[PDB]
Amino acid sequence: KVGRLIYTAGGYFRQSLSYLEAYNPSNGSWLRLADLQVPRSGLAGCVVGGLLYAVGGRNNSPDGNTDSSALDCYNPMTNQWSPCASMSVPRNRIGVGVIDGHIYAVGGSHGCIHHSSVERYEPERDEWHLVAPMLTRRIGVGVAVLNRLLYAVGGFDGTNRLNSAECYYPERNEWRMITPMNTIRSGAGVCVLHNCIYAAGGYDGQDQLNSVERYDVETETWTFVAPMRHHRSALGITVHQGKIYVLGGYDGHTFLDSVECYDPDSDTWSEVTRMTSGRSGVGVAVTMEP
């Protein structure tokens, strides 16, 4: 369990960013690591087998917007990125989840297309294959895995921001709606902690949110927990040692550098560090130090 860092990849501030930076909760330090080969915002991060994966996004620059179908793999042992097989389609504002060593890429946008499609990556074969699409088209969708079930939460379908959520049952290759959230949330941070799916922040169609709610998969209810100190949409999120960390985002005024940490035992958020610069739309995951 020792020696793990919180990695933040990519993001946006004025343009899409290539940064890979890693935070050590044990000593408060930050390390700047190998840049992404292509800057990307609106991507997601995940880890399989100790390797960090950066999935999807878009490269916004002064000279273009290119939605990304890319899957790139970072090895902390070498501090190097390698390309992996690309997805079937570009997916900006993506969500991802891992089940049993396989990466699920969910939703996202390609130009004005809002995807319901979902695809699954097999690292052993370096192949993607499509699975059943969601019941709803969702961009800015929060994704998490609990008990080997995949959840897609909130987002934007092209017309409305969403409070709805749905669950994917892999052995049936089927999606089913779950109880909707109490709040419409697009671009929220979604993660799993203990037996609950948390949805932190986001945009409700009117304001960036500091509220946080959690879905208990046994009772099928959403309950609010303590709100974050900062309103934020397009935040990064991960779980480490029993606590939720939220990174950056947009509060309606500033691209935040704040990192807050949620303790479920006390139901409190604390501000624990700042990123080296404010940014939104990052991918975040946890793996060993490089």
Ligand SMILES: O=C(O)CN(c1cccc(-n2ncc(C(=O)O)c2[C@H]2C[C@@H]2c2ccccc2)c1)S(=O)(=O)c1ccccc1
């Ligand atoms: O991809 C990008 O359009 C910028 N990014 C992004 C990445 C992930 C999620 C999001 N998101 N969250 C909440 C919402 C929301 O409107 O409901 C969105 C964007 C996707 C939704 C959208 C809706 C209608 C028209 C256009 C877009 C944004 S960003 O570059 O990180 C950034 C964030 C905040 C301010 C500036 C830039």
